[PDB]
């Protein structure tokens, strides 16, 4: 039976990979950073409170100018805000109300949406007339869309619930490349600053790093014990953080191909919805199911502070490009900016 | 403030009033989720998910069929927390067919749906179909193949009563949700009338609990 031989070879390869990972481990980052100054205490206040949504907020994104942001909600609306003055620039009504992801184009021209309808839509903001119209409706997935991100004005990358991630061409409208190899639903995506690689985290408790040009999987990280819900890169493009339902964030390194540090407290028994970094990566923000956010020290694994004030589950948060503010969205239909 | 700033504030106020009007219009709809394991004909017609909109006696309905979403439920069930009710369809003549037993699988799915943590106060509408075929074929095969411990009369009415009891006796915490049962037909829009009655009862309870007197 060739199946038994293939399984034995795969087990041998996994054992060799584990042995190499163990041999590559010399010292721990905790031991290295045990002699660094701790962050004292962080007390941010709600500078702004954006209102106007009528249902649970599922996603949000920041503009490159660090002033304009887009929000997605289950009432079939897509609002672009002015963070400084709490003004609304646009209100886009969608065809399907079951939206679960949103993106803002790096050029500021287009926006995107997706959800349970298997179709990723694209909208055009700057037109000769005074309204926003649909420019394209991409189809070709079999399960729901979880995450969508822009590479340029002509390329988009999406992740689906049928164990596949695809790269699309907006002008043509067809799938240029399809990445396969997962086992369960894919939930989160994150793009590197060089825009040449990206990582995905699925429900089989695994992490996969892809290459856009070649179209293949490079490395596999397996440390978790349950579902994985969120991903986010380190600014330098050599590490990323993961959120899971076992009440544990984790940090992985691309060069060492091993798990570095874990975060866990005996008072945390909930899940993790969103994870983001600061500009320098010293402070790590994670949204929890217990109605408030936690600020973690990325180099000493200590609890710096708590950003409380949300009356329901926080499902999304992000930091500006200049590191000047953060904004958290929650199921209580509110957005708050903290400085 | 300058001229352009004042004009921007005016635009924002217009957007506000449009959003408020849209929300006020949309708050008065009835949302239903359709599930099954069993034939959606006469219940949905009479990729992704399918919308279905209709009006019956001055009420706007939205029926969502999610039969084509073959993925892990536990990661998109929570979108349907605020649905008004659930419609559940069961085949009544699949007791003697192996996929395990079809009706055993139906019971397992019903238990998992009813004992979910997001549906502690959601009414369940139960439709049983193919009653004519079940009555035709009840005489040629006994009921011991599925439930060995029946020990009773082998007639259509008794079998239907036993099945209804078996399906109604699986709701733990039977203090916050009510399960309705019906035998489907094809005359006088009786199915739509039944759905209308169920949603009317649920709406009355929800208004009572929202006004804070119960």
């Amino acid at each position, epitope marked *: 039976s060739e199946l038994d031989q293939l399984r034995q070879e795969a087990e041998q390869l996994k054992n060799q990979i584990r042995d190499a990972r163990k041999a590559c481990a010399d010292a721990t980052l905790s031991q290295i950073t045990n002699n660094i100054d701790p962050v004292g205490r962080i007390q941010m206040r709600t500078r702004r409170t954006l209102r106007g949504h009528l249902a649970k907020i599922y996603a949000m994104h920041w503009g490159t100018d660090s002033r304009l942001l887009v929000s997605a909600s289950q009432d079939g609306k897509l609002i672009i805000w002015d963070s400084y003055t709490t003004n609304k*620039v646009h209100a886009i009504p969608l065809r399907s109300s079951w939206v679960m992801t949103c993106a803002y184009a790096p050029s500021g021209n287009y926006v995107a949406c997706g959800g349970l309808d298997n179709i990723c839509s694209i909208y055009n903001l700057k037109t*000769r*007339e005074g309204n926003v119209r649909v420019s394209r409706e991409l189809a070709g997935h079999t399960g729901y869309l979880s995450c969508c991100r822009f590479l340029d004005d002509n390329q988009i990358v999406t992740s689906s619930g049928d164990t596949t991630c695809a790269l699309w061409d907006i002008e043509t409208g067809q799938q240029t490349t399809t990445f396969t190899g997962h086992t369960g639903d894919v939930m989160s995506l994150s793009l590197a600053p060089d825009t040449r690689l990206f990582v995905s985290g699925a429900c089989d408790a695994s992490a996969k790093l892809w290459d856009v040009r070649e179209g293949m999987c490079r490395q596999t990280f397996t440390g978790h014990e349950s579902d994985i819900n969120a991903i986010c890169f380190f600014p330098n493009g050599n590490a990323f953080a993961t959120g899971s339902d076992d009440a544990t964030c984790r940090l992985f390194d691309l060069r060492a191909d091993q798990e570095l540090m874990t975060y866990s407290h005996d008072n945390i028994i909930c899940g993790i919805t969103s994870v983001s970094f600061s500009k320098s990566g010293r402070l790590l923000l994670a949204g929890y199911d217990d109605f408030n956010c936690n600020v973690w020290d990325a180099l000493k694994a200590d609890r710096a502070g708590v950003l409380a004030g949300h009356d329901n589950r926080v499902s999304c948060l992000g930091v500006t490009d200049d590191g000047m503010a953060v904004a958290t969205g929650s199921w209580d239909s509110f957005l708050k900016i903290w400085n | 403030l*300058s*001229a*352009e700033d004042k004009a921007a504030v005016e635009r924002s106020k217009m957007i506000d009033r449009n959003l408020r009007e849209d929300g006020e219009k949309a708050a008065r709809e009835v949302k239903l989720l359709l599930l099954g394991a069993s034939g959606k004909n006469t219940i949905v017609k009479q990729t992704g998910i399918v919308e279905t909109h209709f009006t019956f006696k001055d009420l706007h309905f939205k029926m969502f069929d999610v039969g084509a979403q073959r993925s892990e439920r536990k990661k998109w069930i929570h979108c349907f927390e605020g649905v008004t009710a659930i419609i559940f369809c069961v085949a009544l003549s699949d007791y003697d067919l192996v996929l395990m037993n079809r009706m055993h699988a139906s019971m397992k799915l019903f238990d998992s749906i009813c004992n979910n943590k997001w549906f502690t106060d959601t009414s369940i509408i139960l439709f049983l179909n193919k009653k004519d075929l079940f009555e035709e074929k009840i005489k040629k095969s006994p009921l011991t193949i599925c439930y060995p411990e029946y020990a009773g009369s082998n007639t259509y009415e008794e079998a239907a009563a036993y099945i209804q009891c078996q399906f109604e006796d699986l709701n733990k915490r039977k203090d916050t949700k009510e399960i309705y049962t019906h035998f489907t037909c094809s005359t006088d829009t009786k199915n739509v009338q039944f759905v209308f009655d169920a949603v009317t009862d649920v709406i009355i309870k929800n208004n009572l609990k929202d006004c804070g007197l119960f």
Partner: single-chain antibody
Amino acid sequence: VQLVESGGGLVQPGGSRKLSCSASGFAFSSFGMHWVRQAPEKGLEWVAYISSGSGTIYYADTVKGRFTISRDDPKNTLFLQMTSLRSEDTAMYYCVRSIYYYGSSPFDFWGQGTTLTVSSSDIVMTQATSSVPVTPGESVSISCRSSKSLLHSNGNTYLYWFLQRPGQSPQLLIYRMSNLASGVPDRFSGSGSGTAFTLTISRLEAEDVGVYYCMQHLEYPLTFGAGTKLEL
């Protein structure tokens, strides 16, 4: 996207006439509409303004009390009621659209123009340059001045540019400092600070002949300047 103006004619003093304009090719209801007239041999003068939602109506001192402005969104038609005519009303009337949000470009499009002949605390904008000859392939500079500095506390400067081709409606070139509108070649640049303004044309072509204009948008008397004429 086009604007057509209708009406006009010859009215004796003491009479009345109602100008009308029609629009097609864009979302009319979400725009604010202006009125601008031009004397037979003089510059451009601002008359009235109506906003989207009909919530803001601004007039001019010379025409206050004798003019009325209104719009009809369902019919895509604009009006300007006009009573108690005088001998200074002889001009050619225009119609301009304007939209306001963060990053928008007001005054982007211009109408055609109709002629009406009748038988018989304001910022001063100064631009003394006029009748300057031009040569193809050479750089040309146009200056402009104002009494009050145009730099607001929010970091903005509210100044505009317009180009009057021979026998044609004005075209918007630059709407604010260091900003080029759609359809403008990348050889027109505008810079300055405070009360000093300039416009740079690196290589002027044959279509670069006409009259240029300044405009302010700080508060709401609206003032233009005696245009600078460039001829080959």
